[PDB]
């Protein structure tokens, strides 16, 4: 058989970055050649596993972490990087084996009037442990005074919408991302 990369990369919708999807892939032969040989992928870079020798190494399991981030925010999807995404939404470990693609997705994702399907975590009292997602959605108390779960001044909702527009530049346009990992 073959691993279901067609379901992943060619899917219709991707999860937002803060609640990124995680797909476990196993018990199949994975043909990375079609992924490597694609003109659409405006990003393909990876670590400890050469892109040529992808079809040479068998791992116990393979993950496919998919999400959608802003175009200018892709550089933070890299081991050891920091930023909004790396610190609060999706953190990659320093010993990361497996790798990352990203291709512009403006037509699929950005619609006139704002696409509120995509969100990212904005505040968090502590940086994420690597490969760990949080779904806590309590009103973030950024001041000393309590506010009891009522959004207002000094208490900000921790999620913010990307608000993709087709008229944005390539910096702010949506980039679907897939972060493969191995054993």
């Amino acid at each position, epitope marked *: 058989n073959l691993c279901p990369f067609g379901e992943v990369f060619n899917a219709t919708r991707f999860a937002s970055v803060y609640a990124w999807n995680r797909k476990r892939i196993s018990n199949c032969v994975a043909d990375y050649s079609v992924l490597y040989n694609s003109a659409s992928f405006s990003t393909f870079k990876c670590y400890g596993v050469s892109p040529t020798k992808l079809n040479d190494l068998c791992f116990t399991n393979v993950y496919a972490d998919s999400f959608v981030i802003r175009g200018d925010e892709v550089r933070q999807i890299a081991p050891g990087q920091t930023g*909004n995404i790396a610190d609060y939404n999706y953190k990659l470990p320093d010993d990361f084996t497996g790798c990352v693609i990203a291709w512009n997705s403006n037509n699929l994702d950005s619609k006139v009037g704002g696409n509120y399907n995509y969100l990212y975590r904005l505040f968090r009292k502590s940086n994420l442990k690597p490969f760990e997602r949080d779904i806590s959605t309590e009103i973030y108390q950024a*001041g000393s005074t309590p506010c009891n779960g009522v959004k207002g001044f000094n208490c900000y909702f921790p999620l913010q919408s990307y608000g993709f527009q087709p008229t944005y530049g390539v910096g702010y346009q949506p980039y679907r991302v897939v972060v493969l990992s191995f054993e």
Partner: antibody, heavy 116, light 100 residues
Framework: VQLVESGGGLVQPGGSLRLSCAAS????????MSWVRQAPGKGLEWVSV???????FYADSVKGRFTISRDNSKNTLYLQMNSLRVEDTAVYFC????????????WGQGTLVTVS | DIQMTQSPSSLSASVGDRVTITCRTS??????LHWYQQKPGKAPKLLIY???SLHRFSGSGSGTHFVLTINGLQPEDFATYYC??????????FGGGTKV
């Protein structure tokens, strides 16, 4: 909310000087904080920022010299200015950067850190 | 690296006049240009954020041209006004600043 920064003085070039913003109602362990310096007669220039998780960033002209940090116990924000030069003589504001539309909500008052 | 441009600078002290400040930016920032009003001797005051929403001033613009408008000028607003924008690579760039 009365962010008050203090610690300005005169330090010979290449010395080291400490700035301290003392937040009144904010808690620096949660908010993003930043230092913005205005050279005499010029406009504002960014210096550093510290995220809620502790991640820090620095401007190109001050990377490797200043270090921003905060202490939660007394709710204070620190800027370890080291390797001071002639062009660091300015006024240092501690702002309250907001991850949203990314703007400096509330500002400090001004401490004239001078070099001579 | 973004490069901003505030034109014009040191406007005319004309009380009760529509005052206009523009901020041409070298690259397309969507709605991420914020307007600060730094009175002399004080710290900036955050008139506007998102280039449109207040915090009488009325700002507008997107992409490359952003405008700060003071429909009714008061003798209490003869100050210096700055832009702002933060790159995704965390870097805020302040504009040159215009007097009034």
């Amino acid at each position: 909310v009365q962010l008050v920064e203090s610690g300005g003085g005169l330090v010979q070039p290449g010395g080291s000087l400490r700035l301290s913003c003392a937040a009144s109602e904010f808690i620096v362990s949660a908010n993003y904080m930043s230092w913005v310096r205005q050279a005499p007669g010029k406009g504002l220039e960014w210096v550093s920022v510290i995220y809620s998780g502790g991640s820090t960033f620095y401007a190109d002209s001050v990377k490797g010299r200043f270090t921003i940090s905060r202490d939660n116990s007394k709710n204070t924000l620190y800027l370890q200015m080291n390797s001071l030069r002639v062009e660091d003589t300015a006024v240092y504001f501690c702002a309250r950067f907001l991850p949203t539309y990314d703007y400096f909500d509330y500002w400090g008052q001004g401490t004239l850190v001078t070099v001579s | 690296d973004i490069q901003m441009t505030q034109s014009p600078s040191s406007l005319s002290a004309s009380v009760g006049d529509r005052v206009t400040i523009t901020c041409r930016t070298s690259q397309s920032i969507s709605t991420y240009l914020h307007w600060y009003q730094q009175k002399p001797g004080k710290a900036p005051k955050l008139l506007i954020y998102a280039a449109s929403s207040l915090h009488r001033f009325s700002g507008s613009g997107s992409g490359t041209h952003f405008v700060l408008t003071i429909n009714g000028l008061q003798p209490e607003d003869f100050a210096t006004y700055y832009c702002q924008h933060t790159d995704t690579t965390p870097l805020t760039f302040f504009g040159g600043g215009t007097k009034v």
